[PDB]
Amino acid sequence: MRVLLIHADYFEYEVKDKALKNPEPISEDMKRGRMEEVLVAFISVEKVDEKNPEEVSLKAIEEISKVAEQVKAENVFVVPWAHLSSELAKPSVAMDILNRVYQGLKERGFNVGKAPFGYYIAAKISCKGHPLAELSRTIV
Amino acid sequence: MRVLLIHADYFEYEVKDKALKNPEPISEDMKRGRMEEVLVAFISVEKVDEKNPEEVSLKAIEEISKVAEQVKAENVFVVPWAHLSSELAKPSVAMDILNRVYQGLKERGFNVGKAPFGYYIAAKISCKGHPLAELSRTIV
């Protein structure tokens, strides 16, 4: 799994077309979302993560939480994201891990949002420019 | 070299603190920049790119130009970017390649902007959500 963490003034998204034939089902009010003062976790779930969804999930929950504590973010937003890896997991593995990660950050105490899986999504972001506002983590 | 290409409604940046002790020198009016309808090329120059700045530059110019032609972007914005690689080049190599890339896209005919090297930078982006609006390329 590779993750890119961005500490943002805001993150907002709008779902556009489906990218999978059978993407994640969504209500009309999950087509758009917005958080402020939020750590956004762009997560690319890799093929090698199939080998251990549980351990990879737990590690990602901790890494993301560490950063959120350090930058004083109470809001965390999980984003399914193809673009940090060229060995992507199957949709079932990816969705499994992304949900685990999401539920774990909620148990940790954060206010957690997530973007639906399997869609092309337009999005707007404002990235803070402090030393810790953009970080990469590799988790395996 | 790894590159992330984002087709954006707009990209805007403001330079914050220096990240290097001796970053790229800048005038007051390069502290902030903005382009609309722009392909933004986030470029992580890697250690392995030291071996051949010229070939790696030429390849990156072509890949970025291919995408710009395909998405009908006339504006291209080059962004120095640590976050797609964990084997980063020395600042001299990185700046060498980023300038080559910048000059090449200008020769190709694009309207090209660039962010200064060596700074923490706040930035705002609006990413189009069409199938080709976010692409990753590895160039070696």
Q: Which of B126, B125, B98, B130 lies closest to B114 in space, CA to CA?
A: B98
The token pair at B121 is 């930078």
**How were these coordinates obtained?**
X-ray
Number of folded domains that form chain B: 1
B97 sits in which H/E element? helix B91-108
The token pair at B35 is 């382009």
Q: Are B105 and B69 in contact (CB under 8 A)?
A: no
Q: Which of A99, A84, A102 lies closest to A139 in space, CA to CA?
A: A84
Domain of B129, CATH number, reads: 3.50.80.10
Q: How far, rounded to the nearest angstrom, does the alpha carbon of residue A117 sit from its chain's CA centroid?
A: 10
| Chain B residues touching A130 at Cβ < 8 A | 16-17, 120
Strands (E), A19-139: 32-44, 75-80, 111-114, 119-127, 134-138
The residues that bridge with B33 in the sheet, in sequence order, are: B13
Domain that holds residue B40: 1-139
Distance CA A75, CA B140 (A): 38
Q: How far is A93 from chain B (nearest CA, A)?
A: 21
Distance CA B45, CA B21 (A): 19
Q: Give the pairing type, strands B2-18 and B119-127.
A: antiparallel
Q: Distances in Å between the alpha carbon of B112 and those of A104, B56, B108, B132?
A: 43, 19, 10, 20
| Chain B residues touching A123 at Cβ < 8 A | 126-127, 129
User: Which residues 60-99 in chain A show a CB within 8 A of chain B?
Assistant: 82-84, 86
Contact assignment for A135 to B17 by CB distance below 8 Å: no
Contact assignment for B135 to A83 by CB distance below 8 Å: yes
| Burial class, A61, CB count within 10 angstroms (exposed 0-12 / middle 13-18 / buried 19+) | buried
